[PDB]
Amino acid sequence: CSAGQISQTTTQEPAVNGVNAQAGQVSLRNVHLRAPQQTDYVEPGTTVELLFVAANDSTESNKLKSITSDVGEVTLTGDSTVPADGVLIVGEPDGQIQAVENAEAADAVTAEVELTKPITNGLLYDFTFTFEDGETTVAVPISAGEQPRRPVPPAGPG
Amino acid sequence: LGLMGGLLTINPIWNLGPYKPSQVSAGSQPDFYMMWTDGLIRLWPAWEFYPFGHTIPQGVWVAVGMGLVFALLIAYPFIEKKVTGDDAHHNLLQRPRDVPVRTAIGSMAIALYLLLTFACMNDIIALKFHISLNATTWIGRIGMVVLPAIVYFVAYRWAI
Amino acid sequence: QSALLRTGKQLFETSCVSCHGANLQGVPDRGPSLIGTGEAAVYFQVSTGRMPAMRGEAQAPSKPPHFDESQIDALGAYVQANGGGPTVPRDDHGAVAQESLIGGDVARGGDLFRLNCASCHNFTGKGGALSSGKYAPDLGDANPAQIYTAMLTGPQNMPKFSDRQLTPDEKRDIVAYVRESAETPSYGGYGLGGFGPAPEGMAMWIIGMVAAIGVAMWIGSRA
Amino acid sequence: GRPGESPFVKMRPEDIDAGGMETVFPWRESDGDGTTVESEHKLTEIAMGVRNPVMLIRIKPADMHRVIKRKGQESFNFGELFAYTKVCSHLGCPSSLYEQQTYRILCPCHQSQFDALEFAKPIFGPAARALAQLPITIDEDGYLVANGDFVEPVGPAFWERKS
Amino acid sequence: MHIEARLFEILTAFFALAAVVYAVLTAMFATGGVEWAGTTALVLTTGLTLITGTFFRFVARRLDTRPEDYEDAEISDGAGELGFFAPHSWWPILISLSFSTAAVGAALWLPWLIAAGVAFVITSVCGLVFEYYWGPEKH
Amino acid sequence: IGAPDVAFPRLNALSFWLFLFGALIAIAGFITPGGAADFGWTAYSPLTDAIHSPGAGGDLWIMGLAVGGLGTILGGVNMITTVVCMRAPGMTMFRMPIFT
Amino acid sequence: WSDALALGWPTGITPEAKLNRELWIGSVIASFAVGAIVWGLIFWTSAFHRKKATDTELPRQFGYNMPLELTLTVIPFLIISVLFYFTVVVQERMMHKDPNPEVVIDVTAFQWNWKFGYQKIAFADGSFDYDGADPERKEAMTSRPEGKDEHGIEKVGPIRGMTPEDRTYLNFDKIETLGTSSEIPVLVLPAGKRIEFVLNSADVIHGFWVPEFLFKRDVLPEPKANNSDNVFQVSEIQQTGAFVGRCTEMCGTFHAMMNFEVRVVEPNDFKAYIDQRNAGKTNAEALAAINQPPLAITTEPFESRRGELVPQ
Amino acid sequence: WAALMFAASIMVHLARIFFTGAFRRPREANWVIGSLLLILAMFEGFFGYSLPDD
Amino acid sequence: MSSTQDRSQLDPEVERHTGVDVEDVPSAEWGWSHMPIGVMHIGGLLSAAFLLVMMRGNHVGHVEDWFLIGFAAVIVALVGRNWWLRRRGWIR
Numbered sequence A: 001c002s003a004g005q006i007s008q009t010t011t012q013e014p015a016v017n018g019v020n021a022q023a024g025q026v027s028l029r030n031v032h033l034r035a036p037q038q039t040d041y042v043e044p045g046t047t048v049e050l051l052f053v054a055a056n057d058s059t060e061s062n063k064l065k066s067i068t069s070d071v072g073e074v075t076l077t078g079d080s081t082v083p084a085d086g087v088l089i090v091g092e093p094d095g096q097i098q099a100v101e102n103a104e105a106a107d108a109v110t111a112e113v114e115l116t117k118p119i120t121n122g123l124l125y126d127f128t129f130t131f132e133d134g135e136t137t138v139a140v141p142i143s144a145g146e147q148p149r150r151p152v153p154p155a156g157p158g
Numbered sequence B: 001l002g003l004m005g006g007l008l009t010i011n012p013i014w015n016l017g018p019y020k021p022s023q024v025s026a027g028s029q030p031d032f033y034m035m036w037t038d039g040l041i042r043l044w045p046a047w048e049f050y051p052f053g054h055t056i057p058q059g060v061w062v063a064v065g066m067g068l069v070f071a072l073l074i075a076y077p078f079i080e081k082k083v084t085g086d087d088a089h090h091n092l093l094q095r096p097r098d099v100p101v102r103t104a105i106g107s108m109a110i111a112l113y114l115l116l117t118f119a120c121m122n123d124i125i126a127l128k129f130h131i132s133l134n135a136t137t138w139i140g141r142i143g144m145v146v147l148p149a150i151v152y153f154v155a156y157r158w159a160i
Numbered sequence C: 001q002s003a004l005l006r007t008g009k010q011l012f013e014t015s016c017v018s019c020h021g022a023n024l025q026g027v028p029d030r031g032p033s034l035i036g037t038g039e040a041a042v043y044f045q046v047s048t049g050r051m052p053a054m055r056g057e058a059q060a061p062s063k064p065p066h067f068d069e070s071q072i073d074a075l076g077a078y079v080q081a082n083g084g085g086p087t088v089p090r091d092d093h094g095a096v097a098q099e100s101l102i103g104g105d106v107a108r109g110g111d112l113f114r115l116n117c118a119s120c121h122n123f124t125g126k127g128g129a130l131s132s133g134k135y136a137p138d139l140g141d142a143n144p145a146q147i148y149t150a151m152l153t154g155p156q157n158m159p160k161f162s163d164r165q166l167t168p169d170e171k172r173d174i175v176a177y178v179r180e181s182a183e184t185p186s187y188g189g190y191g192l193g194g195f196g197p198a199p200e201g202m203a204m205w206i207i208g209m210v211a212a213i214g215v216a217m218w219i220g221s222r223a
Numbered sequence D: 001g002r003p004g005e006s007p008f009v010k011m012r013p014e015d016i017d018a019g020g021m022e023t024v025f026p027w028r029e030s031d032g033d034g035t036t037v038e039s040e041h042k043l044t045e046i047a048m049g050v051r052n053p054v055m056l057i058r059i060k061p062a063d064m065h066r067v068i069k070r071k072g073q074e075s076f077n078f079g080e081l082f083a084y085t086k087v088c089s090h091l092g093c094p095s096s097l098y099e100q101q102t103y104r105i106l107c108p109c110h111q112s113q114f115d116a117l118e119f120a121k122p123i124f125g126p127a128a129r130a131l132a133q134l135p136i137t138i139d140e141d142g143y144l145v146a147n148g149d150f151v152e153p154v155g156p157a158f159w160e161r162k163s
Numbered sequence E: 001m002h003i004e005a006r007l008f009e010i011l012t013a014f015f016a017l018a019a020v021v022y023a024v025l026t027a028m029f030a031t032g033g034v035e036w037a038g039t040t041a042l043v044l045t046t047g048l049t050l051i052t053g054t055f056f057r058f059v060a061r062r063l064d065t066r067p068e069d070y071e072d073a074e075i076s077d078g079a080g081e082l083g084f085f086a087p088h089s090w091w092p093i094l095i096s097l098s099f100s101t102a103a104v105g106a107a108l109w110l111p112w113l114i115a116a117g118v119a120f121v122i123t124s125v126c127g128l129v130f131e132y133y134w135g136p137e138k139h
Numbered sequence F: 001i002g003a004p005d006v007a008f009p010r011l012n013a014l015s016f017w018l019f020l021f022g023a024l025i026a027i028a029g030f031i032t033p034g035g036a037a038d039f040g041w042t043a044y045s046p047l048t049d050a051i052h053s054p055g056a057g058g059d060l061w062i063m064g065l066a067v068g069g070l071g072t073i074l075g076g077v078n079m080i081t082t083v084v085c086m087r088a089p090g091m092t093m094f095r096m097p098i099f100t
Numbered sequence G: 001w002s003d004a005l006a007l008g009w010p011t012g013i014t015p016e017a018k019l020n021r022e023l024w025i026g027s028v029i030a031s032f033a034v035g036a037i038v039w040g041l042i043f044w045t046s047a048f049h050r051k052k053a054t055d056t057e058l059p060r061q062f063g064y065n066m067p068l069e070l071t072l073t074v075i076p077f078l079i080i081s082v083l084f085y086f087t088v089v090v091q092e093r094m095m096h097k098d099p100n101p102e103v104v105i106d107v108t109a110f111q112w113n114w115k116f117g118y119q120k121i122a123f124a125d126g127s128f129d130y131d132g133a134d135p136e137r138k139e140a141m142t143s144r145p146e147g148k149d150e151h152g153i154e155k156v157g158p159i160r161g162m163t164p165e166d167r168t169y170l171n172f173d174k175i176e177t178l179g180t181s182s183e184i185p186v187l188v189l190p191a192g193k194r195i196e197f198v199l200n201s202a203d204v205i206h207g208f209w210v211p212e213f214l215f216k217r218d219v220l221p222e223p224k225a226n227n228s229d230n231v232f233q234v235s236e237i238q239q240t241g242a243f244v245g246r247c248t249e250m251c252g253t254f255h256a257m258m259n260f261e262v263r264v265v266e267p268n269d270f271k272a273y274i275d276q277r278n279a280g281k282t283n284a285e286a287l288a289a290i291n292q293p294p295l296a297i298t299t300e301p302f303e304s305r306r307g308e309l310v311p312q
Numbered sequence H: 001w002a003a004l005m006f007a008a009s010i011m012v013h014l015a016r017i018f019f020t021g022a023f024r025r026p027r028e029a030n031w032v033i034g035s036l037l038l039i040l041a042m043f044e045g046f047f048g049y050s051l052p053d054d
Numbered sequence I: 001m002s003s004t005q006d007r008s009q010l011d012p013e014v015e016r017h018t019g020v021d022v023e024d025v026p027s028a029e030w031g032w033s034h035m036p037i038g039v040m041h042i043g044g045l046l047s048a049a050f051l052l053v054m055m056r057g058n059h060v061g062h063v064e065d066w067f068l069i070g071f072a073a074v075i076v077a078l079v080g081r082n083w084w085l086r087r088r089g090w091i092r
Ligand code: HEA
Pocket: F039, F040, F041, F042
């Protein structure tokens, strides 16, 4: 009974940097932050993109996606009501492909944030996603999608 | 021995990089004659004691184990002559069947040795024979107490 | 591609929607979310055949692929479009690069393997046992692309070695070491698996001891 | 594992991705690359240090709420990064094996399982003491540096321990 | 040996009839003609019965009426030397264990275990077959 | 049938032991982490392929059934041979009782 | 009395179902009559106790009755022959092969869920010049110029020159009523029409059963290559409303999760539903817009959780 | 391989003498030294494959 | 026919009078044939106690504790049955 009701394989989170928030009627999958940092933090005032996929669990709808703002004044450029038993993909995570060169509704609801606060990759930051059905705190992480490691300066032995 | 040295590969150290404190392997067994030691490590349930500002790690146990093991192996004929009382000059061997108690004791000891040796290989046993590692560990834990008893009973009745 | 995504969606809608929601969000306690897993994850998981998993147990085992290379690419592209993530390496032609993934250095690849891979797999890439019903499978069967994608995406109880931990150079080096160990003949006679002490002791007690005792019975008498 | 030169390179939190483990060592600024003769011996000392190796594991954010901390080690984790000694608390073998989605630090010498989510305490096998957690943080330029020494000795236990 | 022969010729006749009718009624009146699985199985079970019955009929013609095949036969008629009936032997359990080792080596794909089980099976079958022929040790 | 023993009595002992151990190995699917054979008793084809039910439980089930079947075949050989050859002097094959 | 004496068969909703139910009633009558007479015989011979008043006088010892055995071996042949004739005639009315089905539903049934394609709609009154899509059927013929060898082999494919991972047998349609693990697939059908079901299985052989039809079939992976008549027609569905359907084979671990539904509506309601499904709308939206519950009303896609004691 | 055979043959010999009772009155000391001997062999084997730093 | 009867003079040494008898063990005189039932029962109780105490350790799971409990209960039941039968004189 290693394959009983409590089985290791079934209860597994995806091996993705972004967190998964199932709270509310809508499910938030692969929520993360694209924020390349060249120093300890990313200085306040620099725009960082907010990625996630919103999936409407029920066919009966929570397609509003009202504000989803927290400390940082989240802004949803080209906000639209995409979720209808489908997927709302706000941005273009590193590796995300485009079917055609033209983009419907211009940007596909890209979410950007002005930090107003230092942030460094490896931390958890609370982003309150608000929907007409309810609200959820997710603690969005910071993800470096495809950027290779930067060249650390060569060490000088002493 | 020459045929084995040719046709069978023993300790292919080149596959085994130079020792580093950080590098590891999953197998990590010693030769079969210390596999009983390693299995005794694996099966002994993580029992430690903490005196006044001191620690008695679970590893200590195995040392005591070896003591007892050796202390019982080296001294066995004297225990045999103390219990049985045979203090006579014996030159004719005895068929194992003719000594059911000692045959059962030796079968029990061999059973415990085999259980410990295979417990050391519980990692590989689980990998090849699909059994959960925890299941093998607990099979060995219950066995080091049960299997000796069953083997003693069976060997006694078999000798008779 | 448009047709590629169409085919991937067709295959997905009738093979895995049960484990993963139609929107690729994992069904609760059946399968995880495929958003952000990437084309590399899909390629490694389906090419090895693991994904039509057909049971929830301690460890999903490898099995014959349920889809062909083109269908593997279709599924991977579908998943890549949905969430966006790691992508399987490819060569100039466009196929899954396998020869090009063999790093030139092997000693450095060997150090990388022993520090990272051997921890659970083996000295020489064989399998290893894990906590409760889990294990690390043998690396002999996996092709260079499969090894690379396995490192690039930690399937289950595998640490996920991002491109930053092991840069494409280090990943190719480790792939080269894995292939070299897997296909290298065991110098010094039949290599009894890769585990030394256990097969070696078993072979002693069978071959050498049975031979010696049989020869003793032949030379000696019975009484 | 480069052949001799710069075997150790500074590290950044972004490098470890959720559900990823990397072995890290205590590299000083003075212990520069192995180019010179003075170095390549300090680096050899770091490599051969029995208790030097540590494993840094990035706990998945979704699993973050499950983490149970150790008294006096509540801030040792830098966000979702946890540094635990690789040296097993039982007989001092490296505990290299790491299982994500179950967060099990496994030692193969004697098959001992520590829970990585909860402070790295042994939940199976011979080990009875938790792996020592290394304080970590990020310094100037965002590189991961130990935030201090282990609050307790890190190798396998001995008589003069836990006082 | 005539009654147990006739039994097998009756079975052979029925099985031949069944195979023929199945083949005829599947080659047409079926989606894909002859099923080729049930048909071959019926044909070769007919062959099974045919071989056993042919051997039994051969022996029956070769054999004069035995007491067991003779009605109104006294028990004293069959009294006499019966053949060798193997006494106690521990080789069957060893053969079973050897085949079990080979079987687990097959199920669990362990080619080394398959080879070890095959060697054990050969050794144990040799022991069983040679059990009552091994001459005394000559020293 | 008035016989002293079965035709090949070492063979029927072998049949019993082949059964016992084949059944044991088939049942041993449970100790495995994946578990025993999840496909129905009938074990229809595609569900039994390595793709579906890839666990070692199915393989153990298959091989244990093979071993038990070999034991059963040997038992059948033994019993048919015993009935045809080993019989009492007066026990005509139409005078042997219906259980035989 | 019939429902109780039907041994719990759901009164069919199709002419074929009704006739099968009548055959079942008759067969159960015959079986119960035979069972009653045999039980009477057994219990009445059980009245033959060893009465103590009987001295050492053993019974007639008769055995070996020729005429009685001949009679009771002839009569069962008569009963089974009549049953076989009724079986053949009823079976004839189960695969009629009407070349002009009113609606052809493509029941493609994959591991642990279903999918219905509405392959074609053709109403006799005159309407619905509808057809399935079928650009989606693509093969996997691995007819590459060369394999691992330098030349020569030019391997074509394992099976009939193609790969096992071909999936050509599957046919895809424009209006797919796919069901998710959290959404029960509801098959919308018109009442009073001939409905054909083209049965296919994506992954593993398993079963398609609608108990109210009093009929079932096995969706095999590739029925044509298995000499199977996967497609089957239903002459009519009088009763409207929802009716459960169940997988009646072994799909796999989540084999009990395969439950689907068939919601038979009026022909005009079906027309509206198909009109609103042609336009981009889920099955739930189309059903709701015709003033019908969106979710399955006979069954629910019960918990994906492995069980009750799982810690959420 | 000779080290492994040395160990295994020592074990088999020990089992033989134990089960046959060859350790009784005349030959306890032999047993004792043999036991010590076995122990030494084991440890030397440990020191053998431990010599090549691996 | 190639065999001859054997006879052995074996030094006999307790006086093999208390404990086992040749009827129970046909080779009682030829060597150690009696293990006291007291050591049986004590060892069985110790085995059961060891099985229970292993419930205390480092293992979050409880299937393991239940298996330990079952095996120890089986051992205790066997020892109790044997002791009861011996006390009553092998009855029931
Ligand atoms: C000889 C064959 C046989 C026998 C005797 C039985 C006996 C029983 N069966 Fe049977 N059953 C089958 C053969 C048999 N079955 C087959 C072939 C199937 C189909 C399998 C498939 O679909 O693949 C089946 C399917 C089957 C199912 C369907 C399961 C499913 O597929 O979903 C069910 C459900 O209740 C069931 C119930 C029972 C019950 C309640 C009994 C009772 O008669 C059982 C009596 C119970 C006992 C005798 C146990 C009491 C003993 C103890 C408590 C002591 C235990 C102690 C130790 C083990 C140390 N059986």
